[PDB]
Design a protein around this nucleic acid. Structure first.
Ligand SMILES: Nc1ncnc2c1ncn2[C@@H]1O[C@H](COP(=O)(O)OP(=O)(O)OP(O)(O)=S)[C@@H](O)[C@H]1O
Ligand SMILES: Nc1ncnc2c1ncn2[C@@H]1O[C@H](COP(=O)(O)OP(=O)(O)OP(O)(O)=S)[C@@H](O)[C@H]1O
Ligand SMILES: Nc1ncnc2c1ncn2[C@@H]1O[C@H](COP(=O)(O)OP(=O)(O)OP(O)(O)=S)[C@@H](O)[C@H]1O
Ligand SMILES: [Mg+2]
Ligand SMILES: [Mg+2]
Ligand SMILES: [Mg+2]
Lengths: 432, 432, 432, 432
DNA sequence: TTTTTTTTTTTT
C-alpha cells in the first residue's frame, strides 16, 4: 500500500502530521517508491512543507537517475491521487506496513550478519556488526508503534512521580555506615560509581571489599577482572569473608578443615548471595561482551546480578570506536557512557576503578582534575570516591576517602573521612 | 561432518561423555542423520549405554520406518568407523557444527514466526510463538557451547580453589632469600615484572643475575635482547655462573682448561636448565615476534621456556599501534599490555626493565612518578623494583633496590633493602 | 615431490617433527598443493597437531574455494597415502626440494625487481627492494638448509663463545692507550659511541682524530658529515696526519711538494685504510640513506667500512618517522636507535656526536643529565664521552674527558684522564 | 641505441676515451651489434687507433662473417653517421644501455646455473659455476658504472684537493679587509652565516649592506625580504650604492637626473652583478618556497645566484612543522637547518639575521649562552657575527663587531673589531 | 591546515 501512503502524505495534512515523524526511506522499496519518497523527503527538508504534484515533477526533472527509474517515478507520481478515506484505517494500516517492513529489514540484516561472520577473517567486510548484536537489532524492529512518548509533565503526572519516592527499590544500601550516610541510603541502580586511587594504593581492594559486603547482604555480584585472573580476585574475597590474611593462605597457616568449616558456615547462612568472577584479557571486553556474558549467565547459570563490578574501565574496549582511532579523552568518555548505558539497561549498580595522573601519585591530596585518561569520565559518572594514602596513613592502617563527585548528596559535607583499610584481609572497616 | 559425529558417538567414549548432553535431534538433519540420531538416543534412553552397530541394525529391524528413508538410513549406518581422531579438534568441530545448525534453526523459526504474524488471526497457527519472543530465542541460539563453566563461583567452586593454595602452581622462587621474603614465594606465572633504574645503572646486570639464579633452579630461561646483542649477555651469564670476573675474560686471565672444566661441571648437574639468548634489532620485534620465536623454539628443539627476560620493553614495538602513530604513553602501555598477555598465555614469568626520567639520574631516591615513557606501565606491571646507585653505594659495591609496586605483598614491610652488587661478576648478593 | 612431502607430513610423526618448522607456503605451487598446505598449516596453527584425512576433507576443505580449486584439493587429498621410505632419504630429498624452490622464488623476485626498476618513477612500486639488494636475496636463498640455529644456547655453544673470547673478535683497538685501558681493548663492532663537547669545544676534532687513528690502524673509515662539507673534514684529516697546522694549509706556508710528498709517504704505508668522506645536507640523511651509500660504496669502489663516523647524530632524520615532530626526545632517540641498528647489521663501529645543554657551557664538569637533544640517546649508546675544557685547559692545550656512560667497563675506574688536545693540528695526544 | 654507440665510437674522441674501457663484446648482441663491436675491438687492438668508417668497412671486407652476418655488417656500417650529440646525454645513455645488458646477461647466467644444478650429477657441465657463485656474479653485474665518484676518497683525491686549497675554490671574499682577515679569505659556499641583531641594534641594515658589497664584486645576489617590500630593500641598496642618504630620497633632494646618471655609471662598469629582490609575507616563506623561487629564476630569469640573503630568520617558517610561532626555539632550529640544507644543495653563501637574549642586549659583550636562539643557532651556523650597538659606539658612528662562532677560523684570533656603520647610507666602512 | 584533549619532555 505504498501508493496510498504517498498519496495521503501529499493530499492529507492530518495524515502527514502523525505518520511523517516515523516514516523512513528503508520502508518502501528499492525502486520507484524509494525514489519518490526521497524526492518528497528532500522537498520537506528544504521547505518544511508537503510538495505538490507540480513540485514533485519539477524535482523529478532535476534528478540524475536513469531512464527506467525516471519512468517508474513518473508513473508512480501520475498514479498518486487523493481518495475518500478515514484517518483511523490509514494510521493503523500504515503502522502495520511500517512494522512489517522493519521486521523484514531486520531479518535481512540478521541473515547478512550471519553469512558475513561465517567468512575467513581479513575478508569479512568489516564495519558489519558481529553476531552478538543479533537480538538487539530485532529489539529495534519491535519498538516501532507510532506511539512516541512525548515526555513527563510536572503537574499532569505527579501521582506516578510520588509513587517513586517511598518505593526505594532504586537504592541499594551499602554495609558500611559512612558510605550509606554520605549517599543517603546507598548507591542507586543504573549508575556508574568510580574509585580513583592511583597505582597500588587500593582501588581493587576497595572493589573486592564492596563485592564482599554486597555478597553478605543477599546480593548477586558479578566481578569482572580485565587484568587480574579469577583466582586472585577469589583469593581476595576469601581473605575478606573468612577473616584469614592473604599471608596466611600463602604461608599455609590455615588448614583444610578450617577452610571447609568456614565455607560451609557461610553457605548455611540465608543472608548470602552468589558471587561470580569472570576474567577477560586487557582490552578484550566491551559493553556488548558484558551483555553477552549477562545473557549466558542468565541462561546457563540462572544468575541475575545486581551489583555488576568491572575492575578498570580504562582497561576495557569501546564497542563503537575503532581501537587507537580517537585520543584517550574521547575513547574513555565513550567507554564510560557505554558502561552507564549497560547499567541503566540491566538496572544494576555498576562499580569501577579509575587511575589518576602521574602528578597525583605520592600526594597528600587528590583533586578531580587529577583524573588520568579523560575529563569526561567525571562528567559521565554518578558517584566518584578518591582513595588517598600517605606514609602516615599507611603506618596507621588507614586511608582517606575524599568525595570527588557526589551525585547522591552534598559532597561538601563529610568530604574527607578515614577508612580503616586492612590490606592483609582486603577489607574496609569504619572508625566510628 | 555428521558421519564423524555419529561414528565417534557410537565408538569413542570421552567424546560421548563431553558432547552427549549438548545434543538434540534438531541439530542434525531431516533425513537419514536425524533418524540415526533418534535411534541412538532411544537406545541410550532405554539402556543407559552407547549402542553397537549390531544393536543399531536390530533397532532398525524392530523399529521400522518407511522404506524410502529406511534404505537411506541403513546405507547411512555402513560407514561409522573408529577413526581415532584427536579429542580437541573433534570437540571444537562438533561445537562449531551445532552452533551453525542452532543459528540456522533460530533464523528459520523467526522467519516462520514473522510469516505467521502476517497471516490473519482466523487461520494463524497457535503453536508458533508471538513476535515478541523473536529476540530472546535468538539469544538462546547465541549462547550455545560446550563450556559447562561460564566463570568462577565463590561458594560453588570453593574446592578446586583450595588446591591452588596447597600446591602453589603459580609461585616461582627467586633463589634469593630477601626477594622470596618480600614476595612470599617468588614471582607468579603470567605476570610482568620490571626493574627500573637510570641509564647504565644495572637493569641488564639484575636481569642477568635473575636469569642465572633461575637457570640454577632447573628453569628454561629465554633471554630476548632488542639491544646488548647476544654474546655480551652470555658473557655476563658466564661471569655470574663460572665465578670469573669480566675483566679476566677481556684480559686473558682464564684458560680454556678452566672454562671448559667449569662448563662441564655445570653440565653434569641435574639441577640445571637451559638458557637461550636471542637478539632482535632495537625496535624491530613485538609480541607476535615473540610468539613466533616461542613456536620455532618449541619446534626446532625441545625448549618451552618458563622464564622470559626481555631486556627492555621501551625499545620494543607494539603489535597493534602503527609505528609512531601515538605518543610514548599509549605505545608503551600497549607494549606492556601485549607482553603481559603473552605471559598469561604462555603461563611464564616475564621479567623486563624500564628507564627512569632524566630528573632521577642523580637522585638517591626513585619514586614511581620517575618512570620514563608511559605511566601505564606501572599500572600494567605486577611487580616493580627500583635500582638506585649513588657514590656512597658505589664505594661499597651496593645498590638500593626499592619496592615501587607489589601485587605479591605489602610494599611497606620491606620497602628499601641494600643489595651487594658485584659488577665484575654481574651478580647480586644479599647482605647477611 | 609435493605429494610425498604432504603424505609424510600427514602420516609420519618423525618426518613432521623434522621438516615442519622449515616449511613455507611459497614452496609448492600456485594450485592444489598450495591450498592443501594452507589447510594443513591452518589446522596445525589452530590445534598444534597434524591433521588427518577426515579433518582435511571435511573440517577444512569446506571453505571459500572455487570449483577448480575444490576439485584439485579433493584429488590431491584422496591421492595422499603413506609409503615406506627411509627417514634419511626423505629428509635429504625434502631439503633439496626446499632449496631448489627457494632459489626459484629468489630468481623470480630479482627478475621482478629488475623489471620494476626499469620502469620510470611514479609507477615504481615502492617498498620493493632496489637493484642493489639482488645479491643478498640470492645469498639468503642459498642458505635455506634445515639446521636448527635459533639463538645462542649457553651450554651448547660455549666453544664458539670461547673462540670469540680468545680471538677478541669484537674489539677494535684505539691508537691511544688511555682509551684502550678504559675500554679493555677498544670499541666493539655492533656499537654506537658518542662524543658530547658543546659548541666549538671539539666534537669534530675528536671525530677527525679518531678517524685518523683508525686510518693509521689499517681500517676502512667512512666519514658521513651532515654538518660539514666533503672538503672541510678532509683538510682536518690532512692536518692531523701530515703534522701541518690547519692555518698553514690556508695561508700557504706548505709547498705542494710537502703535501703530495707526505701523502705519497702515507700511501706507500700498508697500514693505511680509506677515509672516504661523504657530505649530506643538514637534516637530509637517514639510516636508509646510509645503507644506500654503503651499498653504492661496496658495488662501485669495493669499499666495506669497519668504522662509520657520523659527524652529528642530532641533525639527521628518522627513516621510521614519516611526519616531522617538534619533540626532540622522540626524534633523536629514533635516530640513535636506527643508527645502532645499522651498526649492528653492518658490524661496524659507529661513532657520532651529541650536543650538551646550555647549562653545561663553561661548566667545569658535565653530567649525563646535561644531554641536550634527548634523554633516550644515552640509553641507546654503548659508550659516551664528555669534553669539558672550560678555560684553563685551553691555555694548556688540554681537554678533560669524563666517561659519562661506559658499557665496555666500569666508568668509575678512570673517570678523568685529561686528554692533550691540539687544535692547530686537530688531534689528540696523550699526557704519558 | 647500438647504432649511436658504434657511430660515436667511430666518429668521436672524448666519447671513445671515456667509454672504451667499459665496453665488451657481450654487451651488444648476437648478430650485427656484437660483430660490429668485435670489428672495433679487433682494429683497436692491431692498430691502436679508431678505425675509419671505411676502415670499419675494411674490417667487414676482411673478416669471417656468414652471408647474413656479412650483409648485416655491411648494412650496419653503411648506417653510421658523424652526427653531433651532446656528450653528457651520450655517456649517460650508453652507461644505462651497458648496465641493462650486463644485468640481462647475469640473470641469464644464473638461470642457466640453476638449470644445470638440477641435472644428474654424472651428467652436467664442469665449466658452469656452482650455485654458490650466484650472489657474486650478480655483484659483478651491479659493479658496472662508467664513472665512480662516491664521496671524497682520501689518498685518491689528494691532487684535486690541493688544487682546492691553492685556488681557494670555496671562499667568497667580503670587500671588507677585517672580515676577510677573520674568515681566512671570506665566507664559503654551502654555508649559513648569521648576524646576531641585539637591542634594536639593527634590522636588515647589515644584510642590505652585504647585498651591496657582493653586488660590487660581481656576484648574483638574491635578497628575500619578509618584513619589507621590494622597493624598500632596493632603496636601501640604492642608498649604499649611489651614496645618497636614505632620507634624501624620501625628501626629494636628489633629482631624477643625478639618480639616472649614477645608475647608468654603475651599469657601465663590467664588475657589477645582478640583484633580485623577492618579497614574501611574514611566516609565509619556508625553505621550500625558496627552492621554487630559485627554480623559477633559473628557468625564466636565467638568474642562478651565488649569494642568498634572507631578511630575518625568525620571520621565516619551517617547511614541515605545521605550527608556527612568533618567537619559538624549535622553529628557529628547524629554519636554520633547512636554510643550511638549501645553501649546501645550491652551493651558495646564505646570510640571515636573528635576535638575541635581553642579557645580550644589556651587556656589551654577547655570549653564545646569551643568545635568544640557544643551541639552535650556534649549532647550524658556520659563522655567527654578534653586531651590538652602544650609545658610545653610536655617538662615534661605530658598532662593535664580536665573533661568537667561526667554523672558518679560530674564534679568538680577532674577536672584537670596531665597524664604521653609517645608518643613513646603510653602509659599513672600515676603521683604521 | 586548525582544534582539542593527555602525556612527556625540554627549555627558560
Ligand atoms: N597478595 C597480597 N598480600 C598482601 N598485600 C597485598 C597483596 N596484594 C596486594 N596487596 C596490598 O594491596 C595494595 C593495593 O592492592 P591493589 O588493589 O592490587 O592495588 P591496585 O591499585 O588495584 O593496583 P593497580 O595498579 O590499580 S592494577 C598494595 O599496595 C599492597 O600493599
Ligand atoms: N661490558 C661490561 N663490562 C664491564 N662492566 C660492565 C659492562 N656492562 C655493564 N657494566 C657495568 O654494569 C653497569 C650496568 O650495566 P647494564 O646493566 O648493562 O646497564 P643497564 O642498567 O641495563 O642500562 P643501559 O641498558 O646500559 S642504558 C655499568 O654501569 C657498569 O658499571
Ligand atoms: N681552521 C681552524 N683553525 C684553527 N682552529 C680551528 C679551525 N677550525 C676549527 N678550529 C677549532 O676547533 C674547534 C671547533 O670544533 P670543531 O671540530 O670544528 O667542531 P664544532 O665546531 O665543535 O662543532 P659545531 O656544531 O660546529 S660547534 C674550536 O676549538 C676551534 O678553535
Ligand atoms: Mg588493580
Ligand atoms: Mg639495556
Ligand atoms: Mg661542527
Amino acid at each position: 500500500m505504498v501508493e496510498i501512503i504517498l498519496s495521503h502524505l501529499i493530499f492529507d495534512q492530518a495524515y502527514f502530521s502523525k505518520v511523517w515523524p516515523y516514516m523512513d526511506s528503508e520502508y518502501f522499496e528499492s525502486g520507484p517508491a524509494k525514489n519518490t519518497f526521497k524526492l518528497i523527503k528532500s522537498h520537506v527538508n528544504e521547505y518544511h512543507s508537503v510538495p505538490s504534484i507540480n513540485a514533485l515533477n519539477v524535482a523529478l526533472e532535476n534528478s540524475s537517475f536513469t531512464e527506467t527509474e525516471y519512468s517508474g517515478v513518473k508513473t508512480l507520481i501520475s498514479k498518486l491521487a487523493d481518495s475518500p478515506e478515514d484517518h483511523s484505517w490509514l494510521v493503523k494500516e500504515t503502522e502495520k506496513y511500517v512494522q512489517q517492513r522493519a521486521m523484514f529489514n531486520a531479518t535481512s540484516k540478521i541473515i547478512e550478519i550471519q553469512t558475513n561472520a561465517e567468512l575467513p577473517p581479513e575478508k569479512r567486510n568489516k564495519k558489519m556488526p558481529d553476531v552478538g548484536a543479533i537480538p538487539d537489532i530485532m529489539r529495534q524492529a519491535l519498538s516501532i508503534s507510532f506511539d512516541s512518548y512525548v515526555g513527563h509533565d510536572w503537574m499532569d503526572d505527579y501521582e506516578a512521580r510520588w509513587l517513586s519516592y517511598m518505593n526505594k527499590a532504586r537504592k541499594v544500601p551499602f554495609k558500611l555506615r559512612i558510605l550509606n550516610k554520605i549517599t543517603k541510603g546507598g548507591a542507586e541502580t543504573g549508575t556508574l560509581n568510580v574509585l580513583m586511587a592511583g597505582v597500588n594504593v587500593g582501588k581493587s581492594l576497595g572493589l573486592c571489599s564492596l563485592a564482599a559486603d554486597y555478597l553478605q547482604l543477599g546480593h548477586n555480584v558479578l566481578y569482572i577482572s580485565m587484568q587480574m585472573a579469577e583466582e586472585v580476585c577469589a583469593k581476595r574475597i576469601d581473605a575478606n569473608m573468612l577473616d584469614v590474611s592473604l599471608d596466611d593462605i600463602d604461608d599455609g597457616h590455615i588448614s583444610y578443615a578450617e577452610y571447609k568449616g568456614k565455607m560451609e558456615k557461610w553457605r548455611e547462612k540465608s543472608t548470602l548471595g552468589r558471587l561470580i568472577v569472570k576474567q577477560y584479557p586487557t582490552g578484550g571486553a566491551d559493553a556488548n561482551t558484558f551483555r553477552s556474558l549477562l545473557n549466558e549467565l542468565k541462561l546457563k547459570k540462572n544468575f541475575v546480578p545486581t551489583i555488576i563490578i568491572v575492575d578498570y574501565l580504562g582497561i576495557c574496549k569501546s564497542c563503537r570506536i575503532r581501537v587507537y582511532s580517537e585520543n584517550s579523552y574521547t575513547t574513555v568518555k565513550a567507554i564510560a557512557e557505554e558502561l552507564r548505558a549497560l547499567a541503566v539497561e540491566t538496572e544494576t549498580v555498576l562499580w569501577t576503578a579509575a587511575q589518576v595522573g602521574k602528578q597525583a601519585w605520592d600526594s597528600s591530596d587528590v583533586n578531580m582534575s587529577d583524573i588520568a585518561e579523560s575529563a569526561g569520565l567525571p562528567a559521565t559518572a554518578d558517584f566518584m570516591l578518591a582513595v588517598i594514602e600517605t606514609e602516615e596513613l599507611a603506618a596507621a592502617e588507614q586511608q582517606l576517602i575524599k568525595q570527588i563527585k557526589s551525585r547522591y548528596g552534598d559532597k561538601n559535607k563529610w568530604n574527607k573521612f578515614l577508612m580503616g583499610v586492612q590490606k592483609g584481609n582486603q577489607k574496609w572497616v569504619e572508625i566510628e
